[PDB]
Amino acid sequence: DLPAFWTVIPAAGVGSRMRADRPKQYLDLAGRTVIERTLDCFLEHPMLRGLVVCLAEDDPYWPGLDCAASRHVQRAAGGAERAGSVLNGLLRLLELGAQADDWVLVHDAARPNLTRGDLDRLLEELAEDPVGGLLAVPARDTLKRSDRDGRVSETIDRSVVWLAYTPQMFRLGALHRALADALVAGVAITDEASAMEWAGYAPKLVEGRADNLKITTPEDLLRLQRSF
Amino acid sequence: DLPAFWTVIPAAGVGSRMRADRPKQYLDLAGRTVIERTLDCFLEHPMLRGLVVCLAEDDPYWPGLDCAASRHVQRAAGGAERAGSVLNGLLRLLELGAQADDWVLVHDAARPNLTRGDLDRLLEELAEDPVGGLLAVPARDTLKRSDRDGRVSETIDRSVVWLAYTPQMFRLGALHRALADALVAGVAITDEASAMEWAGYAPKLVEGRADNLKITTPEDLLRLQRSF
Ligand SMILES: [K+]
Ligand SMILES: [K+]
Incomplete structure (x- = not known):
C-alpha cells in the first residue's frame, strides 16, 4: 500500500518574454512540451493528493498549455531560486489541506521520462523511512x-558514488524547516536533499533508471525523442 | 608546434559472429559506422605518425569497411582485455618505427565526436608534460x-571532480611498462590513466568538450545523430 503524497514541480525563473531558445520545460518532445510530459508522470497516480507547479506569475508559455486549464494542476508563485520556489510550493500545499507529516515529492520540470515503476519504487521504499530520500543512479x-595544479590526485571509488536524480521525497514540515533555515543560513542549496543534509539528516538513496534524464541542452532532447 | 604522435584505437573483443544488436563501434551514425567516424578524428592530422586499430583477428564487420583497405590504418591483434589490446597496439607501433619516448594517444573506438580543437588542445597542453594526461570534463x-546502509554520507565537492574522457596521451615506453606491470600485479585497470596512476604518476587533466561522448547504449547514438 503506497503512501499518499503531494507533488511540487519547481518550474519558475522563466522570463516574461518568449525566446527563440525556449526554456527547456517548453521544448517540444515528440509533439508535446517537456513539462506536459513531466506532469503526466504524476497526475493519474492513485495516491496523488495534489500537484503544484511553481511558475513565474508572468510566464508567457504556460497559459497556452492545456495543463494551465486543469483542475488537477495547481499553481504557486516562483521564488528567487529553487528553494524559495519549493517553499512557496509547500505553502500552497498547506492551503490545499496538506499536513506537516505528509510526504512531498519534488521533481525537476525538465525530467519528463520518469517511469511509474521508479515512482512507485521511491514511494514504497521510503514510506516508513525516518527521513525520506531520492532517486539516484550509480x-x-x-x-x-584534481589536485591544486590540475593533475589527478586519485581516481574516486565510484562504487559508493551516486548521481542524484529526482523525485526527492521528504515530509512537508521537515522539508519546510530545512529549506527556510538553509536559506537564512546562506547555504548553497542545490536540490532538496542538499537542504536536508545541511539540516543534519541522511536521505536514503533509492536506485532508479538512468534514462530518467534531465533536459539541460536542447541536444539532451534528442536522447528522449523515441521514448514516448 | 604540436608534437608528433601515434594513435591506438582499442576495438577488439568483438565476437566472430555478427549480431542483431551490433557492437557499438559498428552502429550506423548518420550513414557511416561509429568507428569509421572515430578514425576520421585522427587520420588527417599532420602530426600523426601512424594509427593502429586493435581488432579481433576474426572480426566479421571490419573487413567490409573501407578503412580495412587503407594504407593509413594499421592493425594489431586484440588482447584478453583493453590493457592487453593496447599493449599489442604498442608493440605494433614499435614495428612501425615508434620510439620509446614518442607520444601515444589511446582513444575509445566508440567516441566518434572528438573535435580537432580538443585533439590539438590535448597535444599542445601535454607536449612538454613530464607524464602526459587525458581529456576530461568537469x-x-x-x-x-553512500554509506554502508545506502543513506547519503556526504555530497561530494564536485568542483574538484572530473569525468575521464579520451584520448589519453602518454609516452610509449612508460605506458608499456605501466600496463604490463599492472596486469602482472592484478590491478583492475580501466583506462590508460588508471595504469599510469597505479605506477605512481599523476596524469594532467586537460579540459575537453562534454559532447565527446562514448556510445554505450544504442540510445546514446541518438544524441550524436545531428553532429555530422
Ligand atoms: K524554480
Ligand atoms: K579492446
Whole structure:
C-alpha cells in the first residue's frame, strides 16, 4: 500500500518574454512540451493528493498549455531560486489541506521520462523511512579528483558514488524547516536533499533508471525523442 | 608546434559472429559506422605518425569497411582485455618505427565526436608534460556518497571532480611498462590513466568538450545523430 503524497514541480525563473531558445520545460518532445510530459508522470497516480507547479506569475508559455486549464494542476508563485520556489510550493500545499507529516515529492520540470515503476519504487521504499530520500543512479563514468595544479590526485571509488536524480521525497514540515533555515543560513542549496543534509539528516538513496534524464541542452532532447 | 604522435584505437573483443544488436563501434551514425567516424578524428592530422586499430583477428564487420583497405590504418591483434589490446597496439607501433619516448594517444573506438580543437588542445597542453594526461570534463551532476546502509554520507565537492574522457596521451615506453606491470600485479585497470596512476604518476587533466561522448547504449547514438 503506497503512501499518499503531494507533488511540487519547481518550474519558475522563466522570463516574461518568449525566446527563440525556449526554456527547456517548453521544448517540444515528440509533439508535446517537456513539462506536459513531466506532469503526466504524476497526475493519474492513485495516491496523488495534489500537484503544484511553481511558475513565474508572468510566464508567457504556460497559459497556452492545456495543463494551465486543469483542475488537477495547481499553481504557486516562483521564488528567487529553487528553494524559495519549493517553499512557496509547500505553502500552497498547506492551503490545499496538506499536513506537516505528509510526504512531498519534488521533481525537476525538465525530467519528463520518469517511469511509474521508479515512482512507485521511491514511494514504497521510503514510506516508513525516518527521513525520506531520492532517486539516484550509480556513477558509471570514471571519476578523477584534481589536485591544486590540475593533475589527478586519485581516481574516486565510484562504487559508493551516486548521481542524484529526482523525485526527492521528504515530509512537508521537515522539508519546510530545512529549506527556510538553509536559506537564512546562506547555504548553497542545490536540490532538496542538499537542504536536508545541511539540516543534519541522511536521505536514503533509492536506485532508479538512468534514462530518467534531465533536459539541460536542447541536444539532451534528442536522447528522449523515441521514448514516448 | 604540436608534437608528433601515434594513435591506438582499442576495438577488439568483438565476437566472430555478427549480431542483431551490433557492437557499438559498428552502429550506423548518420550513414557511416561509429568507428569509421572515430578514425576520421585522427587520420588527417599532420602530426600523426601512424594509427593502429586493435581488432579481433576474426572480426566479421571490419573487413567490409573501407578503412580495412587503407594504407593509413594499421592493425594489431586484440588482447584478453583493453590493457592487453593496447599493449599489442604498442608493440605494433614499435614495428612501425615508434620510439620509446614518442607520444601515444589511446582513444575509445566508440567516441566518434572528438573535435580537432580538443585533439590539438590535448597535444599542445601535454607536449612538454613530464607524464602526459587525458581529456576530461568537469562533473556537472550532483554526486552523493553512500554509506554502508545506502543513506547519503556526504555530497561530494564536485568542483574538484572530473569525468575521464579520451584520448589519453602518454609516452610509449612508460605506458608499456605501466600496463604490463599492472596486469602482472592484478590491478583492475580501466583506462590508460588508471595504469599510469597505479605506477605512481599523476596524469594532467586537460579540459575537453562534454559532447565527446562514448556510445554505450544504442540510445546514446541518438544524441550524436545531428553532429555530422
Ligand atoms: K524554480
Ligand atoms: K579492446
